[PDB]
Design a protein around this ligand. Structure first.
Ligand SMILES: Nc1nc2c(ncn2[C@@H]2O[C@H](COP(=O)(O)OP(=O)(O)OP(=O)(O)O)[C@@H](O)[C@H]2O)c(=O)[nH]1
Ligand code: NA
Ligand code: NA
Length: 422
């Protein structure tokens, strides 16, 4: 036993993303998410299902908790996707009142549910658990505030285990006017308590779906969240399937986090379609990953890479993987202090994602985060300097001084990234 991970889904976005993640994980392991059973013995592959899946005599179950302060997003999702026997009731921690898009309400109200969450974790977690993934949006109130509280709680309650966040930033025009407050408060908390924060935003995700997958229409978030699930699944594939070069969660974090504060990561994946996977080279896929068209955070350009992790999945020519390294280092901009021989961390897994020939996933620690975060800060200041929308933060235990303290620590992180940029 070992390497087990527990996934916490928080708020509407966090749980809706959970559907796509768990659908992907079950598909990769030949598990029928509706029967809880292997689809067949003959197509059962040599693998390590226990990373994300709990095998019981009756079948397989997600090592997950489904957490929200209001019940509708989760209940409607479970009904629509027919997930009742997989997202089972004993894995849900739901209240009734909602956070009303205020981080502070999410944080305060979430405290009441922490005892039940810790008891559920300690009831079923193996002692060799390697860590936790928290899936949440930052612009609402529950994912942001309760998600922040959970990050703090787990890091305090389980020292020595990894806490990783998969976190959705607001879109280029925010669709929650309070999102700058919720985002600054969340990123301040994750800077204090997370080990690694992998970021996404819907402007980038919509651009990828319309321009790389050419979907005619996006009617449900499941036709966006699949990209987040793909990143989550591919970066953990070498924990779950054979391959020449495997890597675990903190191995990836250690290679990425050059200074303690630089833990905010931009992900990308290539190719997005099966047809492209059959007509591309390792070099072509890596170049796509390093191109802003494939970044899952909306960026103005390539930025400067401090450190990166590349996962090669599937039908990979190892000599191409290694020989293109000088080309990556020459063609992609890296931060001034990065030695020509450094800044790359490789995993190589023999398992391709569903029906693809091969796939590359990139996690980049990139100075361009400063531009992304500065835009959040500019939005924050436009509200805070006018004292707009602060009342319900103050009423729920976040004083105006506290908001300012979170802003100023956020700015300090931004300046660290900008300084590395040169
Ligand atoms: N990518 C993605 N974004 C989502 C999803 N659901 C909500 N969002 C975005 O998340 C932000 C709003 O956060 P929600 O998750 O709806 O809020 P919540 O965490 O449930 O918090 P409250 O509703 O305030 O209690 C907005 O920017 C939404 O566009 C989702 O399933 N996928
Ligand atoms: Na909600
Ligand atoms: Na909401």
């Amino acid at each position: 036993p070992g390497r087990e991970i527990l996934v916490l889904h928080v708020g509407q976005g966090g749980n809706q993303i959970g559907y796509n993640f768990w659908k992907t994980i079950c598909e990769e392991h030949n598990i029928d998410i509706r029967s809880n059973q292997r689809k067949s013995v003959e197509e059962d592959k040599v693998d390590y299902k226990s990373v994300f899946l709990v095998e019981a005599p009756d079948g397989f179950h997600p090592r997950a908790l489904f957490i929200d302060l209001e019940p509708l997003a989760v209940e409607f999702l479970v009904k629509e996707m027919k997930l009742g026997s997989f997202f089972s009731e004993d894995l849900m921690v739901l209240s009734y009142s909602g956070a009303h898009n205020v981080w502070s309400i999410g944080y305060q109200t979430g405290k009441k549910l922490i005892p039940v969450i810790l008891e559920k974790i300690r009831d079923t977690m193996p002692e060799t658990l390697q860590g936790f993934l928290i899936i949440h949006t930052l612009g609402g109130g529950t994912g942001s505030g309760f998600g922040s509280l959970l990050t703090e709680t787990l890091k305090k309650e389980f020292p020595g285990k990894g806490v990783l966040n998969f976190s959705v930033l607001p879109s280029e025009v925010n669709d929650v006017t309070l999102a700058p407050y919720n985002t600054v408060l969340s990123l301040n908390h994750l800077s204090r308590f997370s080990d690694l924060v992998v970021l996404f935003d819907n402007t980038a995700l919509i651009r990828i779906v319309k321009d790389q997958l050419n979907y005619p229409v996006i009617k449900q978030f499941s036709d966006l969240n699949f990209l987040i699930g793909r990143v989550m699944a591919s970066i953990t594939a070498s924990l779950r399937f054979p391959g020449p070069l495997n890597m675990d969660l903190m191995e990836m974090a250690h290679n990425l986090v050059a200074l303690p504060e630089t833990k905010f990561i931009i992900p990308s994946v290539a190719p997005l379609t099966k047809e492209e996977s059959e007509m591309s080279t390792e070099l072509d896929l890596v170049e796509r990953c390093f191109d802003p068209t494939h970044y899952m955070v909306n960026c103005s350009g390539q930025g400067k890479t401090i450190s990166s992790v590349l996962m090669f999945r599937g039908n990979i020519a190892i000599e191409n993987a290694f020989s293109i390294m000088t080309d990556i280092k020459s063609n992609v901009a890296f931060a001034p202090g990065v030695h020509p021989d450094l800044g790359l961390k490789y995993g190589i897994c023999e398992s391709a994602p569903v029906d693809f020939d091969k796939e590359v996933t990139l996690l980049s620690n990139n100075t361009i985060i400063s531009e992304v975060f500065n835009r959040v800060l500019e939005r924050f200041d436009s509200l805070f300097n006018r004292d707009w929308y602060t009342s319900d933060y103050v009423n729920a235990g976040t004083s105006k001084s506290n908001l300012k303290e979170a802003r100023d620590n956020f700015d300090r992180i931004i300046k660290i990234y900008k300084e590395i940029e040169g």
